[PDB]
Structure 1
Amino acid sequence: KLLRELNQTSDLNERKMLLQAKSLWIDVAHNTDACKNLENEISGIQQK
């Protein structure tokens, strides 16, 4: 019964795990888009 309560809590825990993984993925996406912007800026500087 405590394990069933753990399952009920773990549904929210995995939801929090997914939210934190989504936050990490968005951080990775922010880093990647900023890297793409830096690549565009370096490409413009290389064109100059």
Structure 2
Amino acid sequence: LNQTSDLNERKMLLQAKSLWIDVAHNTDACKNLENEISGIQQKVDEV
């Protein structure tokens, strides 16, 4: 029961941190895409 409890705690913590890492790399990809947006926007401004 205690073994199962700590295993459930570790599993839910791993799931939470996995969702966090997923949204973190998604935010990193969207930030790279926003930097590309800024580059293309500077190109649009020069045009």
5+ long unaligned stretches in structure 1: 1-5
User: What is the Cα deviation at residue 10 of structure 1?
Assistant: 1.3
Q: Secondary structure at the residue paired with 2:18?
A: helix
- Give every structure 1 segment of 4 or more consecutive aligned residues whose post-TM-superposition deviation is greater than 4 Å: none
5+ long unaligned stretches in structure 2: none
The percent of aligned pairs where both chains have the same amino acid is 100
Count matched residues: 43
- Aligned pairs for 1:1-48 (under 5 A) are 6-48=1-43
Distance 2:28 2:2 in 1: 37
- For residues 1-48 of structure 1, the C-alpha deviation after alignment (integer angstroms, 9 at most, x for no partner) is xxxxx3331111010000011110000001100010010000000010
Tell me the TM-score normalized by structure 1. Answer: 0.81
Distance 1:22 1:10 in 2: 18
